[PDB]
Amino acid sequence: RRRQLIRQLLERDKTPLAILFMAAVVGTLVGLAAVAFDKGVAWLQNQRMGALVHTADNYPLLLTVAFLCSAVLAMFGYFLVRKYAPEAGGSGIPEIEGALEDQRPVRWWRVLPVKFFGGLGTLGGGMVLGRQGPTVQIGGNIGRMVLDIFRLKGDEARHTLLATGAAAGLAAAFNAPLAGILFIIEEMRPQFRYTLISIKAVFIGVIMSTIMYRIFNHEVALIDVGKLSDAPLNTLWLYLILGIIFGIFGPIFNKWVLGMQDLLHRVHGGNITKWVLMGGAIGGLCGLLGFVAPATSGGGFNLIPIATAGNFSMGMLVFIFVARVITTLLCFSSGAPGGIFAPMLALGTVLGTAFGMVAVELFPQYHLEAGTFAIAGMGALLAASIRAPLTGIILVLEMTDNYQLILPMIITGLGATLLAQFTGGKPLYSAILARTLAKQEA
Amino acid sequence: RRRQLIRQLLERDKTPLAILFMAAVVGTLVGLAAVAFDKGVAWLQNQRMGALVHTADNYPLLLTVAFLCSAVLAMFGYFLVRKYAPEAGGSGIPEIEGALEDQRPVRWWRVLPVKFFGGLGTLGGGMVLGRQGPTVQIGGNIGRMVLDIFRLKGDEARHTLLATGAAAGLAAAFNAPLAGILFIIEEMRPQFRYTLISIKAVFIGVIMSTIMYRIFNHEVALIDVGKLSDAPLNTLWLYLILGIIFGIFGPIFNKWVLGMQDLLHRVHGGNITKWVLMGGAIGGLCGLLGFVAPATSGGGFNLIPIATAGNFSMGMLVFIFVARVITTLLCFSSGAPGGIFAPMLALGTVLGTAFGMVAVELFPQYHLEAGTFAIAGMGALLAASIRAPLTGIILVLEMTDNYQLILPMIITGLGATLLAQFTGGKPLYSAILARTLAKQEAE
Ligand SMILES: [F-]
Ligand SMILES: [F-]
Known part of the structure; x- marks a missing residue:
């Protein structure tokens, strides 16, 4: 296998232009999707706080619309999952992992609106759950979607645009481009066999995603912790x-x-x-x-x-x-x-x-x-x-x-x-x- | 096929404890090696400078011993390579890369002293090259050397220990433990097929390496740029x-x-x-x-x-x-x-x-x-x-x-x-x- 290697070494890192361009598209959409999901969750959390102020006197009435406002959104989110997309329950990382293994389907016609609106319910309701769940799975399906729409053929493209979507999805959730790329290559990719997932391409998706988030979320850190002491x-x-x-x-x-x-x-x-x-x-x-x-x-x-x-x-x-x-x-x-x-x-x-x-x-x-x-x-x-x-x-x-x-x-x-x-x-x-x-x- | 996956998932990330403990010793050894190498280079660099101090008046004489202290040191380095270990010429990443493909041999009885002393010469003499060549090769060979010495059996052990040693040698040369780990996954590991290289194990060797370097090189950074402005x-x-x-x-x-x-x-x-x-x-x-x-x-x-x-x-x-x-x-x-x-x-x-x-x-x-x-x-x-x-x-x-x-x-x-x-x-x-x-x- 020495002669195949010399052939392979000189052919290394030659990602198809089409995949490269499409990764830029996927990135961008996942970016906007994530930004929307973020603006949505914030708005409901906000309205929910504008409700408690409307009744900030009668403590039992106040403790009631606190409960009901979350209860309604919670249910609506659970319901959209159970009725239209069961695979959109839970995180969404095991599922997109399933898809990279070619063992679970990416039903992007159902999961996009389900995960997006269903999660918008659970998170905006104020449940203990993180955006990255929804953004990753959303991002994965958005990846699948531009695949189908542009009829891109090949294993590389399917695994790549799927990986790129997941990575752009994680990045956008944390304003963390490195964490997204690394997550694909440490955790998300199929762990027990070879794959043709272009890293350069995942990279491009992640950039665009992160630039989109930056258009609508500049000037304020998710977590500001200042500069702590050293460790001897x-x-x-x-x-x-x-x-x-x-x-x-x-x-x-x-x-x-x-x-x-x-x-x-x-x-x-x-x-x-x-x-x-x-x-x-x-x-x-x-x-x-x-x-x-x-x-x-x-x-x-x-x-x-x-x-x-x-x-x-x-x-x-x-x-x-x-x-x-x-x-x-x-x-x-x-x-x-x-x-x-x-x-x-x-x-x-x-x-x-x-x-x-x-x-x-x-x-x-x-x-x-x-x-x-x-x-x-x-x-x-x-x-x-x-x-x-x-x-x-x-x-x-x-x-x-x-x-x-x-x-x-x-x-x-x-x-x-x-x-x-x-x-x-x-x-x-x-x-x-x-x-x-x-x-x-x- | 599916039932195979389900079996593999439930078994994921169970690196053999023998490989784990051995990565520790590799990182430690490559740490010290890298530290020694770097003290080496700086010593000789320093001597060459004091020699120009001894003759700091006679400009052509001064220009001479500059050329000569480096010329000799260089030759000693080119020589040790050509005579005993030619696979120690140049970088030392392509070599170790090949080795992970099982297409080059790791002659550690030869390359360790050659690359170390050969590196000492070229770098110490003030040539335009970097420790990361020597340290990654030295590090892979060290990872190979303990493998043999402890008679570790298996493909996973040969690939892992060879890898953690190379990451540890990059980590060490730069005080960049992340860049070390990342180089193995992005470049060094066999690019065109599956491999059984435990990331947790490379990580462990990178820690121990980096710690060794910190034992001897704390309080100073290789590049200090200060905090620059942001980018609109x-x-x-x-x-x-x-x-x-x-x-x-x-x-x-x-x-x-x-x-x-x-x-x-x-x-x-x-x-x-x-x-x-x-x-x-x-x-x-x-x-x-x-x-x-x-x-x-x-x-x-x-x-x-x-x-x-x-x-x-x-x-x-x-x-x-x-x-x-x-x-x-x-x-x-x-x-x-x-x-x-x-x-x-x-x-x-x-x-x-x-x-x-x-x-x-x-x-x-x-x-x-x-x-x-x-x-x-x-x-x-x-x-x-x-x-x-x-x-x-x-x-x-x-x-x-x-x-x-x-x-x-x-x-x-x-x-x-x-x-x-x-x-x-x-x-x-x-x-x-x-x-x-x-x-x-x-042929
Ligand atoms: F999760
Ligand atoms: F190099």
Whole structure:
């Protein structure tokens, strides 16, 4: 195979022009789609806050339209999923993973309007779920769509424009172009065989997407954390320890999401009506919690700068981790449309902060800031539950811009995956795809 | 088929603990090796400088020992390669790339000391080459050496340990642990078929490597550029134009490194004596230029902060660029052990700043800084010639810490790789491994 190689080496990186141009198209649409989905979620969260002000006196009436406003949107989102596109429940990453394996269909006529409007309901309602769920799957189907529309033929094109859409979708959600590209090549691509996915092409999609988001979202950071302190070599070993903690929690978390998926399935049994009702119940619980204890509900990006800054009592930090574990599980394991990535960032930040607190008091010789540990911890549940450490590290880097912590971030991340592996844990997206492929054969 | 996948998913990322623990030892060994190598180079660089201090009056005598301290050192380096390990000539990425394809052998009993001491010579003498050549090859061979020594069996172990060692050697040379990991996935790993290279394992070797380097090199950064201004969205099209200029130039530079490779192989016909003698001629030239005009010689890192801060005239930039296109082909295409990555960093920084300066006077409305174009340009030649735009971008990011420039950096990089393809350029490292496999089965 020496002579085939010399042929291949000289032919390397010669992506078909058509694929390259189409990637620019896909990028752009995913960009605009993501921007719309973002403006939508914001508007409903806003109207929802304009409702509570209309009734800011009568506390029981006030706690009621908090519940109902979320309940309605929740149901409407659960319903669109159950009736028109069942594959648009949950994250959307296992599904787009399925499609890259050629084992799940990209029904873009149904999922685009379902995921987009159904998610617009669950997120805008204020449930604990992340945009990246919807934007990735949306982005994937938008990729499929321009395939079909322009009748592009070939395996390269199908796998590429699908990959490009997913990457443009992740990027746009976090203003993170590197995190999107890396996610394709670490996690999304088919893991057990070769593929012809042009990286240059995914790159182009991601650029356009990110430029679109930049047209409508300039001048304000998703997460602003300022420039934290450094980490001296004699301080690293503490980050290893923090990883090991994430490493034994990762798998335990994964079990709960899968377990709660089953346990919640008994409540409705598959029945579109009990399910949708259970949706507005979960939705309302979130909209309510979004009033009476906002850090237990919602996306969670708000409490990240706070936790990093040290402005939470250890008691509030313990409260937020428990309450958020409970509501992250309730929302994602229930089947609503929306990702689980982003709420893992809050969960990670909080646990990390909490660690740094204890680290600060036990070791004043180290001159610690608990916020260096929050930031190492932010991408760590991504590391131990999703087993995509290279993506969580680069994503966190892009969002927090604290490069001086790269070594502690890399160490916590690796510590988390190693102990996730070793204690019999599996990548969450892979164990969700698997369950779904398995039942498709049952 | 489907039931196979379902079986594979539930088993994903279970890297054998033996491979994991062994990656740790590879990263550690390549770390120390890289540190030692780098202390090596700097020591000799320093000696050469004190020798010019001893004779700091007699200008022609002074010019002489400059040429001579480097000429000898160079020759020692060309010699060690030609005599004991010819696969240690040049970069050392094409070689290790081939090895991962199982199409080149990893003679670690030979290449470790050759490349180390051969590198010490060419770099120490002040030639236009980079530690990343030596360190990636040294690192792969180290990863091969423990494999053998611990008798590790399997394809996955041979591929992984060979890979983590190469990432660790790139990480180490640059203090760029991400760029290390990314280079393996974007370039070094076999490009045209599946492989069983554990990312978590390469990661572990990169950590240990990088930590070793930090044990000995903390408190200083290789390039310090400060925090530069941001880039308005109405300013981005300038970065696409730059990437286009890098994209037409990439292939042309590639043609020259390949052509000059040939044209120098005439001078000595392959003969160890004429070759070593040409080696000390070029090496002597660089030790000479290393005094009368230091910007035209050496690794090139020293002039990047100067260029980025706009402290060069436009003339001085045109000179430096041309002067370095000359001394880069001469140093690298001559066969001397040493990477071409880093001298491209210095080339891209200079072209960037040049374009930047034009942009400033043409568009005062944009409030531009030439340094922002220097940064987008720094990794663009990497993108255009080597065709690893992801690795280039993340390398410059990790070395400049100007994250607000990510869009401009990605745009120039893509503008570069795109135009390189459209003008029929090829991945330079893949063009070299290709050249080398062809003269193999040429009987
Ligand atoms: F998700
Ligand atoms: F090189």
